[PDB]
Amino acid sequence: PWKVSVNVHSFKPEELMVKTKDGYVEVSGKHEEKQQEGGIVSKNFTKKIQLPAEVDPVTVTSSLSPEGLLIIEA
Template identity: 35%
Template structure:
C-alpha cells in the first residue's frame, strides 16, 4: 500500500486534521483504490467523477443553525489516475464507518 502525504498545513485540511494526515492509496497490478475520511457527509453530499484522467472528489455538507446562520463543510480532492487504470470502472462506496472507498480496475 502506498500513502500520499499532505503537503499543506493540516489544521486547514478538514476532516483529516484529527487523523494521521494521510489519505490511503492502494495501487496494485489488479486495482487502484483511494480511501478517505468522509464521516460527516451522507452519500448524496458526495460527488465522485473522472475528468480527463483525473479522479475528482467533492464533498459538501450544509446545516442551517437557526437564526445564527449556516454551518458548512466542504472537501475537494483530485488525483491523477495512473495510465494503466480503466477510468470506466471507477466506483465509490461510503462505508458504515464513514470511509469513502473509490476503486477502479486496471486495464486489461
C-alpha cells in the same frame, strides 16, 4: 488492486459527489444548515485523485465501505 480509501468525516453519503474525466477523479462534499443563532452554516471539501497512467478515461469504481469510507479504485 489499486485503491484509495477516503475518510469523508461527518459528511453524509447523500452529500458526496464523485466526478471523473481524463484520468482524474474528484470527490467532494457539501453540507449546509440553519443555525439562526450562529455556528457553522455550511461546509465543503474537495479531493483531487490522480489515477494510474494506464487506465482508460472515465473508468472508475466507487462505493461506500461498511465503515462509511468512500472507496475509489480503477
